Scaffold this active site. Sequence first.
Site, PDB file in Angstrom:
ATOM      1  N   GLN A  11       0.875  -1.177   0.000  1.00  0.00           N
ATOM      2  CA  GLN A  11       0.000   0.000   0.000  1.00  0.00           C
ATOM      3  C   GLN A  11       0.916   1.232   0.000  1.00  0.00           C
ATOM      4  O   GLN A  11       2.061   1.133   0.416  1.00  0.00           O
ATOM      5  CB  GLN A  11      -0.952   0.008   1.197  1.00  0.00           C
ATOM      6  CG  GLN A  11      -2.120   0.971   1.031  1.00  0.00           C
ATOM      7  CD  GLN A  11      -2.983   1.083   2.266  1.00  0.00           C
ATOM      8  OE1 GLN A  11      -3.354   0.080   2.879  1.00  0.00           O
ATOM      9  NE2 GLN A  11      -3.322   2.311   2.633  1.00  0.00           N
ATOM     10  N   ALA A  99       2.498  -8.156   5.913  1.00  0.00           N
ATOM     11  CA  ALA A  99       3.673  -8.078   6.792  1.00  0.00           C
ATOM     12  C   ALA A  99       3.416  -7.472   8.182  1.00  0.00           C
ATOM     13  O   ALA A  99       4.339  -7.387   8.987  1.00  0.00           O
ATOM     14  CB  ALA A  99       4.783  -7.310   6.090  1.00  0.00           C
ATOM     15  N   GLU A 254      21.033  12.767 -16.534  1.00  0.00           N
ATOM     16  CA  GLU A 254      21.811  14.010 -16.607  1.00  0.00           C
ATOM     17  C   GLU A 254      21.628  14.881 -15.354  1.00  0.00           C
ATOM     18  O   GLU A 254      22.550  15.593 -14.949  1.00  0.00           O
ATOM     19  CB  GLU A 254      21.446  14.795 -17.870  1.00  0.00           C
ATOM     20  CG  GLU A 254      22.544  15.719 -18.372  1.00  0.00           C
ATOM     21  CD  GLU A 254      22.263  16.285 -19.754  1.00  0.00           C
ATOM     22  OE1 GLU A 254      22.218  15.500 -20.727  1.00  0.00           O
ATOM     23  OE2 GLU A 254      22.098  17.519 -19.870  1.00  0.00           O
TER      24      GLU A 254
HETATM   25  N1  LIG Z   1       1.361   9.217   0.572  1.00  0.00           N
HETATM   26  C1  LIG Z   1       0.742   8.050   0.861  1.00  0.00           C
HETATM   27  N2  LIG Z   1       1.148   7.354   1.954  1.00  0.00           N
HETATM   28  C2  LIG Z   1       0.562   6.179   2.289  1.00  0.00           C
HETATM   29  C3  LIG Z   1      -0.530   5.656   1.453  1.00  0.00           C
HETATM   30  N3  LIG Z   1      -0.918   4.496   2.008  1.00  0.00           N
HETATM   31  C4  LIG Z   1      -0.146   4.293   3.107  1.00  0.00           C
HETATM   32  N4  LIG Z   1       0.733   5.300   3.270  1.00  0.00           N
HETATM   33  C5  LIG Z   1       1.751   5.428   4.339  1.00  0.00           C
HETATM   34  O1  LIG Z   1       2.486   4.210   4.473  1.00  0.00           O
HETATM   35  C6  LIG Z   1       2.738   3.929   5.851  1.00  0.00           C
HETATM   36  C7  LIG Z   1       2.189   2.557   6.216  1.00  0.00           C
HETATM   37  O2  LIG Z   1       2.672   1.576   5.303  1.00  0.00           O
HETATM   38  P1  LIG Z   1       1.790   0.834   4.179  1.00  0.00           P
HETATM   39  O3  LIG Z   1       2.471   1.158   2.881  1.00  0.00           O
HETATM   40  O4  LIG Z   1       0.322   1.113   4.365  1.00  0.00           O
HETATM   41  O5  LIG Z   1       2.010  -0.714   4.559  1.00  0.00           O
HETATM   42  P2  LIG Z   1       2.424  -1.869   3.517  1.00  0.00           P
HETATM   43  O6  LIG Z   1       3.667  -1.450   2.770  1.00  0.00           O
HETATM   44  O7  LIG Z   1       1.198  -2.300   2.748  1.00  0.00           O
HETATM   45  O8  LIG Z   1       2.871  -3.028   4.543  1.00  0.00           O
HETATM   46  P3  LIG Z   1       1.856  -4.025   5.303  1.00  0.00           P
HETATM   47  O9  LIG Z   1       0.502  -3.357   5.319  1.00  0.00           O
HETATM   48  O10 LIG Z   1       2.478  -4.175   6.670  1.00  0.00           O
HETATM   49  O11 LIG Z   1       1.927  -5.262   4.449  1.00  0.00           O
HETATM   50  C8  LIG Z   1       2.076   5.033   6.664  1.00  0.00           C
HETATM   51  O12 LIG Z   1       3.064   5.933   7.181  1.00  0.00           O
HETATM   52  C9  LIG Z   1       1.134   5.716   5.693  1.00  0.00           C
HETATM   53  O13 LIG Z   1       1.026   7.126   5.912  1.00  0.00           O
HETATM   54  C10 LIG Z   1      -0.917   6.472   0.276  1.00  0.00           C
HETATM   55  O14 LIG Z   1      -1.834   6.099  -0.484  1.00  0.00           O
HETATM   56  N5  LIG Z   1      -0.253   7.621   0.056  1.00  0.00           N
HETATM   57 MG   LIG Z   2      -0.857  -3.228   3.256  1.00  0.00          MG
END
Ligand SMILES: Nc1nc2c(ncn2[C@@H]2O[C@H](COP(=O)(O)OP(=O)(O)OP(=O)(O)O)[C@@H](O)[C@H]2O)c(=O)[nH]1
Ligand SMILES: [Mg+2]
Lengths: 440, 421, 67
Positions: A11, A99, A254
């Site tokens: 995500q 995770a 570049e």
């Molecule tokens: N800018 C932005 N940040 C995001 C978004 N979704 C999640 N985050 C950020 O990502 C962090 C949480 O990690 P995620 O990327 O949701 O988790 P994941 O990588 O799916 O890992 P697991 O859920 O543990 O499998 C938080 O600090 C959120 O603010 C998004 O759509 N945009």
């Molecule tokens: Mg996730």
Amino acid sequence: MRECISIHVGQAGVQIGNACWELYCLEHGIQPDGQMPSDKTIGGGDDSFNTFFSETGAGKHVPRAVFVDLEPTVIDEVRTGTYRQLFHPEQLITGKEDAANNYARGHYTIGKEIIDLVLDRIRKLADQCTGLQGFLVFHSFGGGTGSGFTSLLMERLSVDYGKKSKLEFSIYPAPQVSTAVVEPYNSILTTHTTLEHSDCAFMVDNEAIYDICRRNLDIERPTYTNLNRLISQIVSSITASLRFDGALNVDLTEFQTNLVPYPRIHFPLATYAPVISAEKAYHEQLSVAEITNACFEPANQMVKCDPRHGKYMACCLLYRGDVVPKDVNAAIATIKTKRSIQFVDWCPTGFKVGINYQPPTVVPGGDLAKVQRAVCMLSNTTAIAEAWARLDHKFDLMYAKRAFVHWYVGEGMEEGEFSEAREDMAALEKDYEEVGVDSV
Amino acid sequence: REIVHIQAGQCGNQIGAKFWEVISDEHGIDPTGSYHGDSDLQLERINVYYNEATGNKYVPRAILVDLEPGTMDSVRSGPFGQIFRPDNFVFGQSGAGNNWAKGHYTEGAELVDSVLDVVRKESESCDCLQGFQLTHSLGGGTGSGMGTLLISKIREEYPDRIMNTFSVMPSPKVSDTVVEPYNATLSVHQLVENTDETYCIDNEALYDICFRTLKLTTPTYGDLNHLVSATMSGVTTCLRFPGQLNADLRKLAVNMVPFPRLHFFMPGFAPLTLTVPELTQQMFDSKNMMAACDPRHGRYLTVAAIFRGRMSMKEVDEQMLNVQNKNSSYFVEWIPNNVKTAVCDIPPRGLKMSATFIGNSTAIQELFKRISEQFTAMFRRKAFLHWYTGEGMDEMEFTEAESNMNDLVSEYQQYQDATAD
Amino acid sequence: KREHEREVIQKAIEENNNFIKMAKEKLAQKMESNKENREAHLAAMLERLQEKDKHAEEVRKNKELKE
Ligand SMILES: Nc1nc2c(ncn2[C@@H]2O[C@H](COP(=O)(O)OP(=O)(O)OP(=O)(O)O)[C@@H](O)[C@H]2O)c(=O)[nH]1
Ligand SMILES: [Mg+2]
Ligand SMILES: Nc1nc2c(ncn2[C@@H]2O[C@H](COP(=O)(O)OP(=O)(O)O)[C@@H](O)[C@H]2O)c(=O)[nH]1
Ligand SMILES: [Ca+2]
């Protein structure tokens, strides 16, 4: 030729990928089914937009993209959403069990079960490339998959593809839209392990993007859709260099040449303007001078830091839209006299300009206004070390008491990896001091 | 994905039955297991608690356990009796007798294999098992003893799955049985070692809420269970509806449990049958806690707040910051950003909006201290031990259980007195 | 100069190949050490639970010999 393969992990990675590819499709005139009326060459070609899109014999323009997540719900919305026909189903890869905001689960326990499959799908995209330039990896520092699996991937991509270029678009964690207490651990662990395997990394503080959405667009409580659409514009401005070609359009490599003075010092501070609402956009002809001035106001930066209390090692301006060099030179002359722009004594103080005549599009029904010209400043400043300092401080508070450490140790990690990663951050914080300090 | 419910003993089966009453109502599932609901934002994560049998039928993934057949037959004749799958009823013949030893070692050990056969049948059907939740009491025999045996037995076959639990604590105000401090101390021994996240449902707090706040001179178990069902609905809201934050049991455990042994939470709820500041002010208040502990007497290690109903998300962020900033003494400085908040548009039955509170405070030691006194007052003169030593135990186990719970109190105190530098 | 030119391009290939080799061995050792550690934790978890089951058998047998 000059192909780039984007990889969207977890995500944040996937949902920014949703925003980015949607925006690219609107910029190039690619429809949701993948058709492109503009493209007269059917089945392929060597246009600039083909660096990001492969072509089928049926006339479909397929993104050079791989979407990866350890649970299916976020990627299911790609499979269901508006641009479902855009992707081949093999590009969209999912697991069952996520995770759990744990680097250990993402890198080791869960990640190992899917890593070989992801590298197979990336290889199948790489075999379509006549020449492969490199990878753009989209992820978060805070997530388990975003931190853990990305670090595993970046390690494996170094083995399989060697010194081939690897760029990061990294989401730095912010407490306003935070999801876990242990995000500082996941950030320090992934930064340590990825540091040798990344040639350039564009960090994006959610707090900065969140505050820009609140201040400029007048949004009470910005959602991820609000953040991602803003973030996609900066990613688009950075990657517009690869996807279009005018005479002033300079390649991404570049800029890399200027932005990365030492291998470890590869974290450009990105600033973007104008961010403005459609309500306000109405009858404000934002000049080149005004948008360039906005790049040095630190409210518009993607990472919260103070370049004024720091030193520039490079400063690149990526204009797009109705801009000519005459207006840019006048604005830079005005800015040079008025601003705090202190360079290190070992580097030239010039501003590297690039202009891309295709103007910036916006998603219909968006919060962001259609503007005739825009700019993205990429600057290698020592002030970005403040971002590491804030993150390393939150690590120190929890790690001193071994808070939440058993979750990582239970999945096979050792306390050695924590202190080893933290020492590398201490070394990196020291590196940013050394480059800044005046010479013999 | 999937959570496998278990209910053990007289208490566990009653609060379990009320839990399935309330969440089936929220998801739009009638007693015949048929979906007749308005929103889809009810079926999206229905599979966490329900199995999809043929005919679009939704059957709880629930396993009903008791050594007493009487309490299980009352569940089948209740409102949502026929919704449960008939094979999942695992009844014993003997009865508990309010003896932990009978539940854990002898008579409950006779029945434990037949429970596991249903657990293994339910777990095999799951696409991806999150883990298990056990509703039970710590004062009695079955839910106390056999419940902790089930946890140990399920941990043995499923060591990498989450095992949370909803443990109901004894009190002299509600219960009249004198041996309950032994039963509780013996159960706490097991829960410290073999569970990931315990919700401490204190009968003293539920009595005090019913007597003082709700204003009831005669508080029945139905009055107590109305609070428990509302609490259980609240803390499982992020698990049951499509949400951003703490969508599974492991993510909640990773956020709420800084140290493995310190996983005993202090649940809260508001309003007790209305603006966002008032909801926020009420949920943090000591009188709204389902554990009889003042949070002003300790420090919050970690907190999780769930607001339900249509409200300003801007306002929720401000009020959760305003209580944090202006009560920063009661949050540990060495875990930054320890209070997380979730929003859900669907409110609970009857209420326009509500707020549920999950807190890992160091003040929970007051609960365990109270049990330790009631244990030690009897144990100093070896009172009522022929009930247990006759069943085959020895005084080592009581000495160990006492010492292990007093260590837990010392550990909650240790991190209360901890500091940044 | 031709001899130096061949030495430079070979040294460049040596740097890439060593980087690939060092990365592969670091990862292989990390994943192996992590596998060993995680299995060791689950070993000790079940060895604790079997000592509980052995103790539980010594309560059933102990009640048998109290009459
Ligand atoms: N800018 C932005 N940040 C995001 C978004 N979704 C999640 N985050 C950020 O990502 C962090 C949480 O990690 P995620 O990327 O949701 O988790 P994941 O990588 O799916 O890992 P697991 O859920 O543990 O499998 C938080 O600090 C959120 O603010 C998004 O759509 N945009
Ligand atoms: Mg996730
Ligand atoms: N809150 C609540 N507590 C209960 C209920 N039924 C029993 N208890 C408590 O559970 C304890 C006795 O356990 P019980 O479940 O009756 O014994 P078991 O059937 O052998 O497990 C006493 O302290 C009671 O106060 C109930 O419906 N609600
Ligand atoms: Ca073409």
